[PDB]
């Protein structure tokens, strides 16, 4: 934990190349990305940057896992509600409302559908979050949140 | 040449047959352990599983 | 279900056998104020012989 | 004891028994060298 | 006693259950006689994958060159049973497709060649080389 | 196998495995004094991951608790109109359940680093519970023993001049 | 090829399940629960597809009366498996036990239990 | 792959890296650096001692595994005509025959008798001791040697 | 004392004649480490245990007796042998008395020597290191009778207090 | 071209070590941790954890750290290195200071 | 990228790997056209 050599203040033609680089690292930042003037402003936005990164991915990898999750996992599952377990075809039966169940195969459709939907999310969400990688954004220790200048990232003359 | 069923280590198959038969003339060194002169194989060593799990780790 | 699992069995007769005091093996970094119940065990542990 | 003996050496081929004692001893001190 | 009662009831319907199996295809006991048809499908896509293979043979029949049917035919023939006859020998496989060929270039040495000396120098060599009544000597007196 | 790893959180079989209740016991007899700052951020990472991780635990053991309440009503399934004897019986059978999965080890890196670190932190926290918690430390002593683990803290030391504090379970030289 | 087995919907997802005869075929000699509920689930399932009144209607008095006998059959199932875990339950705690080592702190408050404040809660200054 | 050489993958040593000394002992440590240094950068070493290690290495890992390799692959000659009949001879065909299976149970004998005999060579060799208490490399020296043996790879396929 | 490595067996056979020199062991230790907490502990534990697995044993044999005289005076003799043994002949009645003596017995022996082999390898390990590197002092854990002790000083007298010059 | 000019320049100018780092090479390896990139380290003397006195240890630091000379760069280290392989250095083998990079 | 890492895991550094990097790609690239070249003449 030692330190560093404490330069003497800035002269004018210091001060500014500063001024100079800070406003040009102003004239960087987006029009739609709304971070406010600040000190950890920089910081924020880099973790933002990675952030999106990550979130993209979920994303892709969640859409993914429907399509991988529908004829492998839920597909099967509903050839489960074809028959009871005493071999009798599927048939309603209502819990409060006695809806008609007049077409085809309404009931049995339903049910699997009611239990197979929430089925299929949870199964891409699992898949999303066991196949996406947040090891961009991950910080053990917190060393990231340092406050990082406007002035520091740009050199200018 | 002569010398390209060496390149086809890359394949996990044939790293599972090395590993097959390098069991099994371990074991049959370990049954043949009584006879002087052949030290055998001691399973309570780091160096000797370390060369044997991580011989074709990393492979390129 | 179908590994090593740790023993429970312990030392179920010898009184105040986990009362445990200071020494080389513990480090000294107890709580300050337990000296005096170091004491208190060195007591005990001659009672018992 | 004695059919063990009988086997050892005749069921397996001599070839082999060459191999076994060619890949356990040591170039340095083979007899065959 | 109970215990031995218990354990022959197990096996008497472990019994009935594998002779069930095994025997479904005979009766029709089973609604609308479903496991018989089962096993007669069995027959019939074995039946088809025999079929298929001769039928791929056909067209490899029809569209090699006629010099080379027979030969195909012994190895459509090794194929199908003398592989798994053991007392039939590779070998003579070997030996009876090597005298076809034989045969196949000595054929196509009458395709208008046109060499004095060689016409009269392969002919000895293959009439010698697939044992004929021709001796060797008779060709190496010749040349 | 899983592509986040390194995330302090999560863990592989051959991790320390420490429940939840030998987490918080362990947590009752230390203090912030003695550890340095790698030391209180191990411990403050673990008390995010385990704070999440209590949480959860009831949901995972809801299916679990479900199913038994169900298989002790009968065999009828009276939904919406069984949900007294149901719930009565959930509330009874998901408490045994999460004692079960609370009183059941489980493998973090973070168990890993606070317990099996070779600087002083993982020293002081071993002697530590070795002291005030001789039976966590006698579980969790056989446990690390049998990974191969080599502390003068263990009760399992065979080059000790001293003898161990404890009963020395049996286990395979 | 992708579609054949990915898009091609199976023939028993879309039609209507056939009844499974195998698990009518040999049925134990009982009217116990098993059986009763095969009998209930039939009858509910044909006057739930029938166009036939007269024999819906005689599977709707013998579906009343299938629903008593079976919840006959399940209070007998929850009073034994109920007492079986009641009995359990006693029987393991008087076994098992209980820990009494638990820390005491939470019942100790010395600044409460002697008041630190006192001669000053009443206003003296 | 068939462009590249990789026969020295996965023989003497070529494998070690820093996952090998992280869990091993400090004397294990040195063994296993020295092994590595002295099969891959023989030039860290004295010429002597290079005399040595080769002449106790090839005793029990190259020349052994060379002979292996010889006798399993005089294994897959037990008829060198093969496919031969008075007819007609297949002298070509025989030879790639021979090309094809020869080398393959060489190269099996060779992996076999390295995979064997080369962890016990490391871990029960008194030369390979007394030489590693003579250098003493360090962690350095490996990562050192291990630059080196993989620029002198490089080299080797380039050339 | 003069360097001798004690060597845990490994066999299953060295293990198996070893198991039977842990009381020995034991016998020992309470002769080099008597007040010594653990070494203490152990012959409690020990003796305990012998006490309670004996007991155990005894009834378990007694009850087996009792009931196997009670039911053959009704003829009603459980066939769990053979009739009249194979070389001399015995009665499965005197057999099935010989085992429910025995086997209880052996296998109180053997759960004994289960509980405590590892635990005794460990304390004779203990010692044999702190012989070879010429330790006879008493270990950490000891704490002496009586007689033995040091009596604490109760006259403490504070020094006199003086004013600080500063 | 590149390819054909960064070959040749490789097989031409890369040598093995050719020796084992020294003890002052590996202790400077071990205190490297203690350069400071981006921005030099502000050195302060203590004499009883340094020794010397403080121009000597100074300019040994400046030496050592500031410079940029490399541990094998050292007249002493040099000496070193030619007398620990001597054995090397016989029967005309040249020991190479400098690591190839 | 991959090659980086596999060159990382060798002792190296990343600024030294993409120069021992682009080498072995350079080289594997001509031995691709190479192997054309030949199934061409063949
Ligand atoms: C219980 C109480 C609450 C407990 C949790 C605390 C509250 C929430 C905290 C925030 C959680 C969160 O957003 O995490 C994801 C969050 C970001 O997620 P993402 O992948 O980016 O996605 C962004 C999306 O906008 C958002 O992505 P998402 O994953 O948050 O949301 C999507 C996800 C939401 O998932 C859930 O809600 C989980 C549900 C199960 C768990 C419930 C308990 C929790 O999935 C779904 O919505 C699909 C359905 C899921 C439920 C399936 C069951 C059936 C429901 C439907 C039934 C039928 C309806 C009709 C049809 O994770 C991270 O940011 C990871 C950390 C990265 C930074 C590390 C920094 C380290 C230090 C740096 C220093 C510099
Ligand atoms: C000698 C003293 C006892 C007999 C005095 C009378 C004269 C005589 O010899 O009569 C033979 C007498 C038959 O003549 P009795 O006059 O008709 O019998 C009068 C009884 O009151 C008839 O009534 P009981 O037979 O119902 O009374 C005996 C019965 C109910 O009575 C009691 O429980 C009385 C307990 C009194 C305890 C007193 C303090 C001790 O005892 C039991 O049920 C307990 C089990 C007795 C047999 C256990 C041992 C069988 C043989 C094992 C051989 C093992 C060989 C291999 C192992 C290695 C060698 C050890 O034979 C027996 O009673 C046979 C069993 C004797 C058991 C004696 C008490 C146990 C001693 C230790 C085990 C031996």
Not at chain 1, 63 to 83: D, Q
Not at chain 4, 15 to 27: A, M, N, Q
Not at chain 6, 118 to 140: C, E, F, S, T
Request: glycine share 4%; net charge positive; aromatic share 14%.
């Amino acid at each position: 934990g030692f330190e560093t050599v404490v330069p003497a203040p800035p002269t004018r033609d210091d001060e500014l190349r500063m001024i100079k680089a800070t406003e040009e690292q102003f004239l960087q930042q987006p029009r739609y990305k709304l971070y406010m003037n600040e000190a950890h402003r920089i910081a924020k936005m880099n973790h933002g940057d990675r952030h999106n990164n990550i979130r993209a991915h979920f994303w892709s990898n969640f859409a993914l896992g429907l399509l991988i999750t529908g004829p492998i996992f839920i597909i099967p599952f509903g050839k489960a509600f074809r028959n009871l377990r005493s071999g009798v075809p599927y048939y309603f039966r209502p819990k409060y409302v006695f809806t008609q169940k007049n077409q085809y195969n309404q009931d049995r459709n339903w049910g699997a559908m009611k239990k197979q939907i929430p089925l299929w999310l949870g199964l891409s969400t699992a898949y999303a979050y066991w196949f996406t990688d947040f090891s961009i954004n991950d910080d053990e220790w917190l060393e990231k949140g340092k406050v990082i200048y406007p002035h520091q990232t740009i050199k200018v003359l | 040449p002569l010398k390209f069923w060496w390149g086809l280590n890359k394949f996990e198959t044939i790293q599972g047959i090395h590993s097959i038969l390098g069991n099994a003339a371990d074991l049959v060194v370990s049954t043949l352990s009584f006879i002087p002169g052949v030290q055998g194989r001691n399973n309570a060593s780091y160096i000797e599983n370390s060369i044997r799990v991580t011989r074709f780790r990393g492979f390129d | 279900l179908f590994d090593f699992n740790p023993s429970s069995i312990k030392f179920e007769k010898y009184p105040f056998y986990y009362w445990i005091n200071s020494s080389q093996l513990t480090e000294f970094n107890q709580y300050r104020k337990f000296v005096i119940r170091d004491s208190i065990i060195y007591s005990l542990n001659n009672y018992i012989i | 004891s004695l059919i063990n003996s009988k086997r050892f050496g005749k069921i397996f081929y001599y070839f082999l028994k060459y191999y076994i004692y060619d890949w356990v001893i040591s170039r340095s001190v083979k007899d065959l060298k | 006693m109970a215990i031995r009662n218990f354990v022959f009831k197990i096996s008497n319907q472990i019994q009935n259950l594998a002779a069930k199996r095994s025997l479904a295809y005979l009766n029709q006991i089973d609604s609308q006689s479903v496991p018989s048809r089962a096993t007669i499908n069995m027959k019939d896509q074995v039946t088809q994958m025999q079929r298929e293979i001769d039928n791929m043979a056909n067209v490899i029949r029809a569209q090699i060159p006629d010099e080379d049917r027979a030969e195909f035919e012994i190895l459509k023939k090794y194929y199908v049973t003398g592989q798994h006859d053991s007392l039939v020998d590779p070998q003579d496989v070997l030996l009876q497709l090597d005298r076809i060929q034989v045969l196949k270039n000595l054929k196509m040495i009458e395709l208008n060649e046109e060499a004095y000396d060689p016409e009269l120098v392969r002919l000895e060599k293959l009439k010698a080389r697939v044992l004929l009544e021709e001796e060797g000597a008779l060709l190496e007196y010749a040349h | 196998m899983d592509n986040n790893y390194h995330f302090w959180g999560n863990g592989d079989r051959q991790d320390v495995s420490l429940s939840y209740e030998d987490y918080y016991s362990i947590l009752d007899c230390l203090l912030d004094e003695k550890l340095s700052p790698q030391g209180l951020m191990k411990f403050k990472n673990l008390h995010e991951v385990s704070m999440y991780g209590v949480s959860y635990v009831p949901l995972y053991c809801f299916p679990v608790a479900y199913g038994i309440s169900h298989m002790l009503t009968g065999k009828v399934r009276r939904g919406h109109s069984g949900y007294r004897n149901l719930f009565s019986l959930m509330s009874v059978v998901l408490p045994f359940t999460c004692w079960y999965a609370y009183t059941t080890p489980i493998p973090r890196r973070l168990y890993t680093e606070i317990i099996c670190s070779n600087n002083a932190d993982g020293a002081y926290v071993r002697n530590r519970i070795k002291q005030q918690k001789p039976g966590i430390w006698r579980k969790l002593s056989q446990q690390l023993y049998n990974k191969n683990f080599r502390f003068p803290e263990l009760n399992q030391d065979l080059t000790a001049t001293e003898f161990p504090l404890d009963y020395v379970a049996p286990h395979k030289f | 090829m992708i579609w054949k087995y990915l898009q091609r919907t199976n023939r028993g997802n879309i039609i209507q399940a056939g009844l499974q005869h195998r698990k009518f075929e040999n049925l134990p000699f009982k009217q116990n629960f098993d059986n009763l509920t095969k009998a209930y689930d039939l009858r509910m399932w044909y006057i739930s597809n029938s166009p036939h009144e007269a024999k819906n209607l005689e599977y709707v008095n013998e579906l009343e009366a299938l629903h008593n006998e079976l919840n006959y059959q399940n209070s007998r199932q929850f009073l034994f498996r109920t007492v079986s875990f009641l009995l359990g339950w006693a029987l393991f705690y008087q076994f098992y036990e209980l820990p009494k080592t638990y820390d005491w702190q939470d019942t100790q408050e010395p600044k409460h239990q002697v008041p630190a404040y006192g001669d000053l809660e009443e206003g003296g200054d | 792959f068939l462009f590249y050489n990789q026969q020295h993958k996965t023989r003497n040593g070529y494998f070690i890296n820093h996952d090998n000394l992280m869990l091993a002992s400090l004397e294990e440590r040195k063994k296993l650096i020295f092994y590595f240094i002295a099969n891959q950068v023989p030039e860290k070493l004295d010429p002597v001692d290079r005399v040595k290690f080769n002449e106790e290495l090839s005793d029990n890992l190259s020349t052994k595994a060379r002979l292996i390799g010889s006798l399993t692959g005089l294994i897959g000659l037990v008829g060198f005509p093969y496919i031969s009949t008075r007819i007609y001879s297949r002298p070509v065909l025989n030879i790639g025959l021979s090309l094809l299976i020869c080398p393959f149970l060489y190269y099996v004998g060779n992996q076999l008798t390295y995979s064997v005999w080369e962890p016990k060579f490391i871990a029960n060799n008194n030369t390979v001791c007394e030489l590693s208490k003579k250098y003493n490399f360090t962690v350095f020296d490996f990562a050192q040697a291990k630059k080196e043996a993989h620029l002198k790879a490089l080299r080797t396929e380039l050339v | 004392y003069e360097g001798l490595k004690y060597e845990t067996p490994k066999t299953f056979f060295g293990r198996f004649l070893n198991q039977f020199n842990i009381d020995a062991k034991l016998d020992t230790l309470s002769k080099f480490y008597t007040y010594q907490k653990t070494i203490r502990a152990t012959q409690a534990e020990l003796q305990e245990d012998r006490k309670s697995y004996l007991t155990n044993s005894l009834l378990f044999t007694a009850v087996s007796w009792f009931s196997i005289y009670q039911f053959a005076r009704k003829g009603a003799v459980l066939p769990v042998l053979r009739e009249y043994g194979r070389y001399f002949g015995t009665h499965r009645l005197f057999r099935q008395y010989l085992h429910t003596l025995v086997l209880p017995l052996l296998y109180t022996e053997y759960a004994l020597n289960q509980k405590y082999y590892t635990h005794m390898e460990h304390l004779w390990t203990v010692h044999v290191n702190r012989l070879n590197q010429k330790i006879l002092e008493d270990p950490l854990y000891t704490f002496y009778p009586q007689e033995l002790n040091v009596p604490k000083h109760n006259i403490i007298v504070p020094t006199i207090f003086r004013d600080t010059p500063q | 071209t590149y390819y054909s000019t960064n070959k040749e320049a490789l097989i031409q100018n890369f040598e093995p070590l050719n020796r084992k780092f020294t003890e002052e090479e590996v202790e400077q390896f071990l205190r490297n941790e203690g350069r400071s990139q981006e921005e030099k380290r502000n050195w302060i003397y203590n004499p009883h954890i340094h020794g010397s006195t403080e121009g000597e240890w100074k300019a040994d630091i400046h030496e050592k750290f500031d410079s940029g000379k490399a541990p094998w760069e050292r007249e002493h280290v040099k000496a070193k290195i030619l007398e620990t392989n001597k054995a090397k250095i016989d029967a005309g083998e040249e020991i190479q200071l400098k690591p190839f990079k | 990228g991959s090659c980086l890492l596999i060159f990382i895991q060798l002792v190296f550094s990343g600024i030294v790997v993409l120069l021992l990097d682009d080498m072995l790609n350079k080289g594997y690239g001509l031995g691709s056209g190479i192997s054309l070249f030949i199934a061409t003449n063949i």
